[model samples]
Each structure stands twice: as structure tokens, then as C-alpha cells.
Target: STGSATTTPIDSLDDAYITPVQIGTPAQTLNLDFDTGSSDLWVFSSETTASEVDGQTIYTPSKSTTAKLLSGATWSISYGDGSSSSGDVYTDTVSVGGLTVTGQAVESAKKVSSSFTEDSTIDGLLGLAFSTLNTVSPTQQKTFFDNAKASLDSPVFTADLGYHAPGTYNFGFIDTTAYTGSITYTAVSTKQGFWEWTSTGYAVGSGTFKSTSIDGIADTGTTLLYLPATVVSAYWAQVSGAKSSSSVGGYVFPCSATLPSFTFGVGSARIVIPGDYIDFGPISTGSSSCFGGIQSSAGIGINIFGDVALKAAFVVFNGATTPTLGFASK
Candidate 1:
């Protein structure tokens, strides 16, 4: 949960990267970001027009015989990035981890942005988070988890998104092999759509970062760390040569410089954001050259820690753990 509310646990994601897979006999593959924060699993289509869709990955519907259309469930989504899309819902057999999930709800956006048009690396997203946010309802409510739960040895699964590396996050039942920190667990609060938290304090690079003290929520749905704008800016100031860049969505820094390490202390547990996660893409259209990990949030009440940060550590969201905000692996 980014703020006080919980986001929908969508089973798939469409990120900025690409992967290889066969779309049909000739074989086709695409890069995608499998997300759990939202319900819809869509791809920017080649037929998409402007104003209705954004992003680059598109999944052509004509290639697969297993694809099924959800004729009445068409919908649209507006992202915090100000991008939006409208599309028709469909279902098809999708593969992940060499496992195929049949009758998966997929979106074919009718409108798309140039950023989405320019890329062909990934075709679309394949959600594996949970069944709660599966877009198809009534006739097609079952998500990828609903269909594949039988194959899973453990009923529950956890994600450990590793810092710096692409696709380093592990899925399925968590393997505690790499973990060394203590586990402070709690029940997952579902009042809002996204998983939310109330952290006690944040520690940066082993130093206690106490800009504002409140049990703020921790969110894996978001990619950037959202804190009090002033405090976040001040914290960035301490990092040598680190300056804010306007090109990127959040905080951006130079890639060549070494950055200070920091941690967010939450009720005896502290999460560290690796420097590699901080220094982001260069300054260009839709790019921020500064540290992309730490960002400034203009709003109040909810402080979100997006993907770039969460992927660095192992976070456990067991509803059986705490009454609110589950737990984290530091």
C-alpha cells in the first residue's frame, strides 16, 4: 500500500524491459513488467492510437489460437505518471517460468503513446502476483493464481526483488536462503486496494533518518521512495554531488559517482536501498539522470516505496503476520 490504502494485487506486470517467448509458430517474444498493483494485464498494440494508451509493449492478438476475448469487460486505467489507456479484455494461454496458464485475461489497448510505439522488446505483461485483482469478473474471475494454485506446493508466494540486477526478484514460495535479517510480520491490511504500512522511522546507510516520525506505510506496488518532499530533498543533499534532475519521474543522479547508502528503519527492522537502484537513466525526454530510487512525494498521508526500492530486498506480506502492514526482509 503506497498511502493508507491497499492497491489491487494484479497477477501481471508490463515493465520497461523485454523477454523472449514464442507468440506463435514463427515465434515472437516481448519485454514486459509483471505487476500486482493493478488488475488489468495489457500490452500496447500496434493498432493503438494516441490519447487512449501509453507505453510501448504490445501483444498482437492475431498470433495466438488460445486467446479468448472478454467482449464486455473492456476498461481503462490512469497511472500516476499521467498515462492512460483504453482496451478490450481478452484471454489466452500465457507462459512464465516455463509454466503455461490457460485462459488468462489480457488487454489490447486501442490507444497508445509514442514511447510505447517505439519499442518492440516486450509484447505484454504476464501477472503472477495473486488472484484478487484479476480483471475478468463473473465468467472469467479466476486469475493466474486461481488456475495454477494446484501446481504450487505452498499456497502462498513471496517476491524478493534484488537490488541493481534486472529480473533478480524471485517469485513462488520464498526461499529464505539469501535472507539474514529478522522477520517482523503482521496481517495484511486490505482496507485500500494496495498493501499499505506505518513505518516508525527510516535509516539511511546505517544512519538514523528522522525527518518526520510516524508509522508510515510501506508499499511494494510503487517503484520510487515517497517521503516528505522537504525531508527527501534534504536527504539527497547529503549524498555527495547528488542533485535532482527534472527529466526523470523521481530523483535522478549521475551514474559515475558513488552514492551514500541509507536504510529505512521500521519497528526494529531497517531496509537498505542499494546505490545501483539510486543512480538512474540519463537526462533526456522521460529520463532522470539523478538517483531514481529516492523521490519526492507532493502529497501527504501515504508514503510509497515503489519497485526500484522493494526489488532490492525481501518483503513478506503475510496477513497472518501483523494487523496492518505485513513484514519486510532487510
Candidate 2:
């Protein structure tokens, strides 16, 4: 069991996780987000519109002799944040953490939404979800992870995201030093093309754990944790001045307020998220309130265990004969 890559936070907000990936024959390195919630390996490339290009690195496939265009093929993805990117497709050797997958579909972005260009830290995304979710039209393409899994030491990968610190994404192996005790495994439903699972129950602060089920996706692509509105309001109730404001979006609390910890159950295993972790900084530069990382997934159809929930624990995406997800406290 081997293959590991060092990861860095895109910013102090822990907005997203980024890992270096090598593309093309000469190896053009780009910072990419390995999103378990998505299934396309698109990049800010030479084909991208100049207006959408910012400070992010662009992948020049022409520099790679092995790069081959997939004539008439195209890809497009619209995200939860209203951000999106779309472009033509190509095949090239893509490498991550010493694990190489040759002839991997590398989508070259010809168009990108304003949010992508505004956030110059990320060049593109490498989706780790099932190939069934691929956005490529006509003939769909497999994700880098799906292709690499076949040759990996073990058909599994782990995400150890640190709070305001560097972390590691381990492929084919689990790093014991990254977590405590054993990992609690839960059945994964790829039916939705996501690493979707149901949480057993949850507890706010030191309150008794409530018996309920909360189904959600483990999405590294998103920044916040979205749960049922009932659960979200329960946690916010403990905070003195917390309120769900439409103007600022989601729940907000006084900057000086004390937030209670949130704990969610995974097969009887309790993973606690610290109160400070939910204080997602201020709403704006001069705002008197700070945003809450845990928000209500009321109208969003599906709840999400995004970076906010994930950063508190170590997650294992086990692509076994029967796929399962493993979670453990740090």
C-alpha cells in the first residue's frame, strides 16, 4: 500500500484542498483540487478565454508530445456555488503523487465562470467521484482516481486535511499517524455518483446524542458543511447572537460569541467538530459578525459533509469491491 501526496490549503480560510499534479510529457505542474464530489479532470489551459484567465497556472497540452485531442468532445460542470467551467477534451499522461495514469482525459477549459477567475488560487479541478458522474458529452471519461485505482497498491485513498496547516492525501494506503483509534466504516451509495453516506446521529455541545439519520455526500470540493435546517438551528441556538440572515447568507453570530462544539455519529463513533472550527471568519472586511461553517441544507436537496466537516477528521474513500467510507478523529 503506497502512493501519497502532500497537500496545502488554498488560503487561511481552508476554502479548499490543493495538490500538485503533473500533466503532459514535459510535466506541466498545476495545483488542482481533488474533489470526491465531482467527476471531471478539467483545467485552466491554453484554450481558456483570456478574460477568464487570472493568476492561476494554465496547462499547455501542446507542449506535451503525447497529448491527443478528442475531436468533437466537450465537457461542462455547474457547481453549487454557481461557478462552472467547460471546454474541449484531450488525452494525456497525468501524474499525481508518483501514481501515473496515462492517456487520462484532461479537459481544457475554454470557458470559465466569474467565480473561477475571481479565485485565482486554483487552476482547475480533478474529480474523484465515480466515472458515471462524468460531465463529458457523447463518450464519457473516467476520473484520474478511477483510472489510477486499478493499478494502485490498494483500491483506496485517504484525505487528511489539517486546520490552517498542511495535510496529505494517501493513495492505496492509510497513514496511521494521521488519525486516532480505528476508522468507522459506513456503506457508500455511489448511486448518486457521490461518496454518499448516512450519519447515525448528532449531538450539540455536551447534549445527548439524538437518534436520527442524516444522508450527505463527502465533498472535498465545497467549503462549508450543510446539514438539515433542524440540526443547524439547534447548534446556532446555543450561540447567544446567532441568526440566519438572508443578507449575509447562512447563519452568522457576533464576532465575540462563544460557539458550542458539534458532534456527529458514524456507526456509533463520534467525530467532534470544535466550536472555533465553525467560526468561519468575518462576513466581510468590516463586518461585526462571523459566518458559520455549518449551515442549513434546507433547499439544497442533499446535505453535504464538505471541507468544514471533513477538516475535523480523517476520511478514507475506500474503492473496495463494495465501496465504503471510513472516518476517524485526528
Candidate 3:
């Protein structure tokens, strides 16, 4: 079958036999959030304390038809923003968008400390980015794309992230139209699981890239693209009335004002983030405006070119080759 859909518990089993036995099969269903910034897939169990995690779909392992525990292997994922979670590894039959990923590496969070716990809709995140953190033996190979990429029509997946309800995070064969063309491909660096590059400079209203050596990472996991506060402030410097207010440290401006377009100079591609993105709401401190650019660790340390940047460019992630990635453009 090209693919089949089933909302069941995904059971992880050892290589044993019992008359036509199957390993990872869908027994329970999960609504997975596909993220490119990180490289780990996790789920919230019914066993999880409601107070510890809210807005997340809780999976009842006991209710599932099968489950396998990965003894000893512990994992913890920390975000650039200082959010983190720790969990044990397990093998499970993961069913997503009619596709069943077998012998899949799943994280069972022992402790989670993040704002995600507050979002009821966020049960767990499915890290699409590459990582060597796995629950199995021999090689520390985990990641949905690492284990299941070979089985799909094309070793590729797509994201239909939801801003409204009924459909939030849906995965599977990426719609060709999702991007301007086949996800623009780029190679990834070893050790660093995120796709990255050095920027030339910044441009206002889609201009030219300055010949500078500024490096950064392209991450779909993050909600918005972040740059060094200085770089962000510089970009806002172009704005007529941009200011720095207590509400939003980097960007502060008049509530109603015309904003100029801005773009990041990535290699040969100048990724543009529209102007409307800047004009924000008047906040509690009575600040009428704010800058769209956020304070990112980019210039400070690891620069992150998040979904905001990717929305302008079609990105195709290839975990088929270890320690490598690819990027294409729209």
C-alpha cells in the first residue's frame, strides 16, 4: 500500500516471532508537530501530570495495543531560549497522516520545563531536523526521517502548519505548491543538526547583499527568524520612527506607521521578510509599536533563520545522508 491511515497506539516490539508477527504498528494515533529547528520526536503520555503539561494531547500508553521501553537511555532537549525537557527513549509504532513509521524512536518526557506545557494543543513535538539521539542499539540513530524516509514515495515530507483550528500540524507528502519549487536543497554540517549559512548583510525593501561574513543557521523549528539585537536594531534604524521601548526591547515604533520591507542576505539568496511583519500592536506599557525582528542568538552565538525566513524560501530537508542537509528556493 502507498499509505494507510489508522488512529491507534504505536507499539514497539523486539525482533521476535508469533505467526506473522509485525513490529511497529499503529495502535494509537498522535497529532504531531513537525519542527525543523530541533532534532527529536516526543509525545505526552496519559501518565504525564496534567499540571506539568497542558494543551498537549496526552497519549495513554496503557490503552495502546503495544509498547516497548528503552531502558537506561535518557534524553534531554534544550532550546536556545533556555527551555528544556528530559525523557527516556522507547520504540513505538508511529502513525502519522496514514503513514506508519515502525520501530520509531519516541521520547517519554520524565520532566519538562517549558511554556509548551501551557499550550493545550501542543502535546509533543516531532523533530524533523536531524540528530543522532536515538533509543535503539549499535548506532545512536534516531529521527523519523532517519528511520522512515526510505519507505515513502519520495524520501520527503511536507508541513501544513495551522494558524486556525480543525487542522493545526499535519504532515506527510509535501504539496509541491507548498514552496515555489522542490524544497531548495542545501547540505548540512556535521555536529550541528540545523542547516546553516553565513549572511552577507541586510537589505531594506529587497535590496542587495553586502559582502560581509556573517554566518547563521536555518531552522524551521522556531516560530520566527531571529537576528542579533544589534542587527535587528540596525534594520529598524531604517524605519522612520522606530524606537526601543520597554515592551519590546529591540523594536518600538508608532502604533500606526508605514514600515519598509526588510530581507536577510543569505548566500546568493536574499530572503525577504515583508514589511507588514514589523507593525505590531500597542502594548501594556502604552508602547504603540514594536519591531518584528526578535533578539536572536545569531550574532551572539548560533544564529537562527527560523520559519519566518523559510516561508520566503522552499526548504527540503534530506536526512537520508547523515551529517548533511540540502536547501532549495521558492
TM-score for every candidate vs. truth? 0.72, 0.98, 0.76
Model 1: per-residue Cα lDDT over 1-330, one tens digit each? 010111222222312333333332233444455444554566766556655334444566776666667778775665555555566777776554454556666677786544445444434554543446554544445544446555555434455554433333232355567466566654344455545555656656656566445333444435566777776776677676676656545665655667666566556666676655665555564543544567777654566766655665666543222333334554
Considering lDDT, where higher is better, how would the candidates rank from best to worst?
A: 2, 3, 1
Candidate 2 TM-score, true structure as reference: 0.98
lDDT of 3 by residue, 157-220 (tens): 4433222112122233445554453433444564565555566677766455455655677665
- Mark the regions of model 2 whose C-alpha exceeds 4 Å error after superposition: none
Model 1 / residue 277 / CA error / Å? 2.8
Q: Sort all candidates by TM-score, best to worst.
A: 2, 3, 1
Estimate the lDDT of model 1.
0.53
Backbone collision tally, model 1:
64
Best by TM-score: 2
Model 1: which ten-residue window has the lowest total lDDT?
A: 1-10
Error of 2 at 7 (Å): 1.6
Mark the 10 consecutive residues where model 2 has the least summed lDDT. 1-10
Sliding window of 10 residues with minimal summed lDDT for model 3: 12-21
RMSD of candidate 2 to true structure, Å: 0.9
- Decide which is better by lDDT, 1 or 2: 2
